[PDB]
C-alpha cells in the first residue's frame, strides 16, 4: 500500500463545515476503523499511522487515515471552538457522506481529543474506542503545563524550521535512532507545503486555549468499550491522565508501553497492532 | 480437566529443602507455564488458576499450578526468610526434579514476589515474565499500609471463620456477585483442612516482616520480558507499584484493568487469557 | 476552655432553612474562624477542635466551632442535595444571625466540602480558606474507592457499636495510642444521644450519593488564598486529592504530615496550630 | 548584608580533600544553620540564598551559605564519586575547620542530596534537615528522565551562552517576571568567572551518573527531623520525589508551594523564610 494509491478526497456538510474538502487514505474493504492523528506540525493520518494500515488491512479491516480540518491535504481552517469537538464533527461528516454507519475510532493525542468528542457527540455511530495519549484532558496530578513536548510544539508551528522539527521529533519518540532522514523530510515537506496550516492553527489556540478542550465531566456518558494506551516516556501528554481515563470510563483497560514516547503506534507498532486487533475481535 | 485428574505430587531438593513434598496440578505437554498463587489462608495453584488452566493448555502450553510451600498439600513450613526468595528456591527445586530447563512464570501477589525472586536468582531459568500485583515491594507513594486487603488477610490467618473469609473475599473482588457458595466453602474447605498453614504463616511473618520482601532495588537486573497487569480497583497492593515495575524493568509492558481486584485472571480472565497467551506468543 | 462554657445555640434563617436550630462553641473576640467538622456517626465542633480552640483564642481570634445540621446538638435534617452545599448555606445563615461579615474557615473531611462549597457561594464572606483532607472531590487516581474509612463510616451509622466506633477510630487515627477510653465514651455518648442523626445520614446519603458531592469543575473560581493540609496514612480521603486542589485553586500550598490519618488537627496538633495561625496572620 | 562584606575562605581536610578551598558566606552569630545550593552552571551559594540569609539571621541564626566544591569560589575538582556524598564530606570538613559541632542543613536540589547524605554519614553531626526538592533519587513514576531542565542544565554546562543561561531559568522560575538582567548577569559572571567548573562537572557526570547519587534505599536511617519543601512546577525534580522523601523517612513532612519552580526560597521567599525558621525553634 502507498499513500498514492490509497489516497481519497471527499467534501463534508456538517454544522459548521459547508463543502469542506477532507483527504483521507483508504485500505482494505471489512469494518470501517478511522484512524486519527495528532495535531504537531506537518501532522496527517498517512504519516502517524503507516507502519499499522498493512497489519489492520491484512485482519479483514477498513482503514481509514482521516487528515483532520486544517491538516495535511484537508482544508485550512480557524477554528474558535477546541478542536477535539470541530474535528469529530468532521469525522461525522465523512462518515454520512461515506455511508459508514458506525467506526470503531483509534486516536493519538489531538486524535485522541476528537474520538473522545465524537464516543460524546455521536454515541450511535462509534463501535470501539482506542485512545492513544489523548490531550487537552485538563491539568496533570504530577506534570507541570505547558508539557515540554507542547513547548516544542508551538515553537515549532510559530517558528518553522529543519532544526526545531528535529529537536520536536527526538522529544516525540523514545529511540532516537527512529529518526531517520526519511521520517525528517518527509515531516519538514509537509509543513513547507502548507504554511497556511501553521498559522491558522495558532489562530485557533489564542480563540480556544488547551483549557477548553477538556472534556473530563462528560467522560461517564462514554459506553463505548475502551483501550487506552499510553507510552511510559511521553513528554507531550501526561501519564497520569492514562489513570484519568481509566477511573472515569465505565468499560475502559490501559496499556503501558516502556521506552516509548507519544508515537506508541511507530515506536512498538508490533505490538500495538496485535493489540488493538485483539480488542477489536474479542473485547 | 479436574484438580483430581491433573493432581501430583514431587519431593524437592533445594538449599534448605529436604526431602520436601511439593503439590502441583499438570495439564498440557508443550513450552513449560508455571503459575503461582498469592499468599492468602487457604491459597492454592488449582484453585488461584482454574479459568486460566484449559484456555493455556489449548494454546499448547504446559501448565503447571504450583503450591508454594505452607500452603495447600505442600509440605508445612515455618520461613525464617522472606518468601519470595524461599518460595522461588522451591520452584528450582521443582523444575530440577521434573527435568524442566526454562519455564515461563506467571505469579500473582505472593506468587509475583516468587517470579520476581526467580528471575533474579536465576536468570538462565527463566523464560518470560508474567506479574500480576506481585507483593512486598515497599512503600506505596500513595497507598497506606497495611493495606485494607493485607489486614483482612491477617484477620483470616489468626482469626479464622466462614465470616471473616466472605468479608476478605468481597474486598479480593470487585463484583461482589462472583463470590458463589462454591468459591466460599472450597476455600474454606482447603482453610480447615491445613490449620497449621496458618499459624506457620504468622510465625513466618514475624521472622521475616514484608519489608523483608523489597527486591526493588535489583530490579534493574531482571533480563526477562515482563507483562505486569493489576486490578484499578486492587485493595491488597498498590496500584502505584505496577508504575514502579515499569520504571525500573527493562523489558516491561504495564495492563490495568478496569472493574477489577487483585484476581484479574479470575476476573477478567477471557481478556487476561488472550493478552498473556499473545505475549508468551509474540513478545 | 469548656464545651457548657463555650455552647451557644441560634436559630436560621437561609434559602430551605426555617428557624432551625444551629448549635456552635464560641470563645475569643478577635477575627472570626468558624471551624466545620467532619461527617463521621457522633461528630461535632467541640470534639473535633478540641485541641485548636484554645492556641486560636490566645492567637487573637474569635473561635466558633460549629455543628453542621444534622449532626450533635444542631436540628436534624433529611437533605436531598449534596452535604457541602447545604452546610455551607447554614454558615452564611449564623454568619448573618450573628453579624459576621466575613469569616476564615477551617473544615476537614466533610467540613472541607463545607468550607468550598462556601467559598464558591459566598466569595465576598470568606477570608482565608484552610482545608483538611476536603471529602467528595470525585474519584482519586489511586486509591479504590468507597474508601476503607467510608466503609467503616457506613457500618457504624448502619450498625452502631462500642466495638465499630473502635474499629472505625482505629483506621481514623494513625496512632492508635491517642484511643482513650475518654474519645471513644465521648463520641459514643454523642451516637447513643442522637440516632435520628444517624438514620437521616443515611437517607441523605441516598437521595444525594457521594458524586453529587463533586464541585472539582469549579475550583478555578476560588479566589481565597488556600491552605491545604492532609494525613499522609488518611484512609478516608485520598491523598492525590490534596495535589488536585493544589494544582486547580489559584492560591494554594499543600501540607502534608506524616504519621497522619485523617485529623491532622487533633494527631499533629501542636504543628498543625502553628502552622494555620501563621497563615492567618501573614498569608 | 553584602556578598563582599560576608566573604570567607577555609581550607579543608576531610577524607579525599587535601587542603582544599572552600568558600562561603557567613552572618549572624547564633545556631549554624548551613544552606547548599543546586548544581546548575554559576551556581553559588550567595546568590542562591541571598532572600533567605537576612530573615534567618533576624531570627537568631548563623547562617554559612557554602559554595560546594567545583562551583562559584571553591576549588575546582573533578569527582568520580556521586555529588551528594562528596559534599557532604565537604560540608564536615568546613564544620570540623570552623569548630562547628551540629548544624541545621538547608539543601535545594544538588544540595539535597548534599544533605541527605550527611544526615546519613554523619548523624551525630546534623540538628534539623530541610529538603527543597533534592536531586539524584532515582526514577519518577511519572516524569520522563531526563527531565526537562536537567537537559537544559547539561546543554548550559556543555555549550555555555547568555541565551541558554536565560532558556534554563525560564524553565527553573515558574514567574518569568523574577528574571531580571541583574540575575542574568550575576549568574553570567560565576559561568564567566571559571569555565574550568563546567567542563569539570560533566567529566564528574560521566565518572557517576545521576543513578549513582540514589540513595532511596538508606532513607529509614535518617533520624533528623525533616522539613521537605518542592515546588508544584519544578520541571527539575520530579513532585513525586517529595512523597517519596515522605514515605521513607521517619519524621518528615512535606511543603508544596503552588506557582513555583525549582528555587522555592526564591520565588516564595517570605513564606519558605517563616516555615523554615518556625520548624527550625518549633518542630
Ligand atoms: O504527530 C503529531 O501530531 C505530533 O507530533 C504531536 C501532537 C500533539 C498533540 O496532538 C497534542 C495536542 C494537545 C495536547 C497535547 C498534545
Ligand atoms: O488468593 C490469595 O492468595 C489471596 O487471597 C491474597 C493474597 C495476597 C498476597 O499474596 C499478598 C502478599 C504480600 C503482600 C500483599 C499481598
Ligand atoms: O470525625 C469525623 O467526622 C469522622 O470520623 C469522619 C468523617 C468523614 C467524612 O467527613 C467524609 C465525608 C465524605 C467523604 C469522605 C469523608
Ligand atoms: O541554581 C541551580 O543550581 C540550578 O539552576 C539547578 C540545579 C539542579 C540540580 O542541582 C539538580 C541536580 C541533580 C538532579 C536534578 C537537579
Given at each position: 500500500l502507498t499513500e498514492s494509491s490509497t489516497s481519497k478526497f471527499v467534501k463534508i456538510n456538517e454544522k459548521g463545515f459547508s463543502d469542506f474538502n477532507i483527504?483521507?487514505?483508504?485500505?482494505?474493504?471489512?469494518?470501517?476503523?478511522?484512524?486519527?492523528?495528532?495535531?504537531?506540525?506537518?501532522?496527517?493520518?498517512?504519516?502517524?499511522?503507516?507502519?499499522?494500515?498493512?497489519?489492520?488491512?491484512?485482519a479483514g479491516?477498513?482503514?481509514i487515515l482521516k487528515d483532520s480540518p486544517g491538516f495535511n491535504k484537508s482544508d485550512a481552517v480557524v477554528m474558535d471552538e477546541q478542536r477535539g469537538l470541530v474535528?469529530?464533527?468532521?469525522?461525522?461528516?465523512?462518515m454520512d457522506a461515506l455511508d459508514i454507519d458506525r467506526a470503531h475510532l483509534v486516536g493519538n493525542a489531538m486524535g485522541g481529543?476528537?474520538?473522545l468528542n465524537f464516543a460524546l457527540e455521536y454515541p450511535d455511530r462509534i463501535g470501539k474506542l482506542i485512545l492513544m495519549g489523548p490531550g487537552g484532558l485538563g491539568p496533570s496530578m504530577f506534570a507541570p503545563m505547558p508539557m515540554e513536548g507542547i513547548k516544542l510544539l508551538f515553537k515549532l508551528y510559530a517558528e518553522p524550521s529543519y532544526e526545531t522539527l528535529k529537536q520536536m521529533l527526538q522529544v516525540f519518540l523514545y529511540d532516537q535512532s527512529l529518526i531517520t532522514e526519511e521520517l525528517l523530510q518527509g515531516?519538514?515537506?509537509?509543513?513547507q507545503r502548507q504554511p497556511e496550516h501553521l498559522k491558522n492553527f495558532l489562530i485557533s489556540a489564542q480563540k480556544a486555549p488547551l483549557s477548553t478542550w477538556d472534556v473530563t465531566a462528560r467522560l461517564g456518558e462514554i459506553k463505548a468499550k475502551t483501550?487506552?494506551?499510553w507510552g511510559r516516556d511521553d513528554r507531550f501528554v501526561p501519564l497520569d491522565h492514562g489513570?484519568?481515563?481509566?477511573?472515569?470510563?465505565?468499560?475502559?483497560?490501559?496499556?503501558?508501553?516502556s521506552k516509548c514516547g507519544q508515537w506508541a503506534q511507530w515506536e512498538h507498532a508490533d505490538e500495538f497492532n496485535r493489540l488493538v486487533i485483539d480488542f477489536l475481535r474479542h473485547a
Amino acid at each position: 500500500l502507498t499513500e498514492s494509491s490509497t489516497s481519497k478526497f471527499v467534501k463534508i456538510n456538517e454544522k459548521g463545515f459547508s463543502d469542506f474538502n477532507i483527504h483521507y487514505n483508504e485500505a482494505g474493504n471489512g469494518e470501517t476503523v478511522i484512524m486519527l492523528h495528532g495535531g504537531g506540525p506537518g501532522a496527517g493520518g498517512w504519516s502517524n499511522y503507516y507502519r499499522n494500515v498493512g497489519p489492520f488491512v491484512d485482519a479483514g479491516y477498513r482503514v481509514i487515515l482521516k487528515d483532520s480540518p486544517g491538516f495535511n491535504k484537508s482544508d485550512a481552517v480557524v477554528m474558535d471552538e477546541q478542536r477535539g469537538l470541530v474535528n469529530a464533527r468532521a469525522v461525522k461528516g465523512l462518515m454520512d457522506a461515506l455511508d459508514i454507519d458506525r467506526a470503531h475510532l483509534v486516536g493519538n493525542a489531538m486524535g485522541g481529543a476528537t474520538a473522545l468528542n465524537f464516543a460524546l457527540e455521536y454515541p450511535d455511530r462509534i463501535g470501539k474506542l482506542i485512545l492513544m495519549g489523548p490531550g487537552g484532558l485538563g491539568p496533570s496530578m504530577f506534570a507541570p503545563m505547558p508539557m515540554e513536548g507542547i513547548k516544542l510544539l508551538f515553537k515549532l508551528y510559530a517558528e518553522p524550521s529543519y532544526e526545531t522539527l528535529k529537536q520536536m521529533l527526538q522529544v516525540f519518540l523514545y529511540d532516537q535512532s527512529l529518526i531517520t532522514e526519511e521520517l525528517l523530510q518527509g515531516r519538514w515537506e509537509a509543513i513547507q507545503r502548507q504554511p497556511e496550516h501553521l498559522k491558522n492553527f495558532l489562530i485557533s489556540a489564542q480563540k480556544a486555549p488547551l483549557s477548553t478542550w477538556d472534556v473530563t465531566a462528560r467522560l461517564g456518558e462514554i459506553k463505548a468499550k475502551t483501550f487506552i494506551t499510553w507510552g511510559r516516556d511521553d513528554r507531550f501528554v501526561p501519564l497520569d491522565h492514562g489513570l484519568k481515563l481509566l477511573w472515569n470510563i465505565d468499560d475502559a483497560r490501559l496499556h503501558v508501553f516502556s521506552k516509548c514516547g507519544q508515537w506508541a503506534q511507530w515506536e512498538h507498532a508490533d505490538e500495538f497492532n496485535r493489540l488493538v486487533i485483539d480488542f477489536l475481535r474479542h473485547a
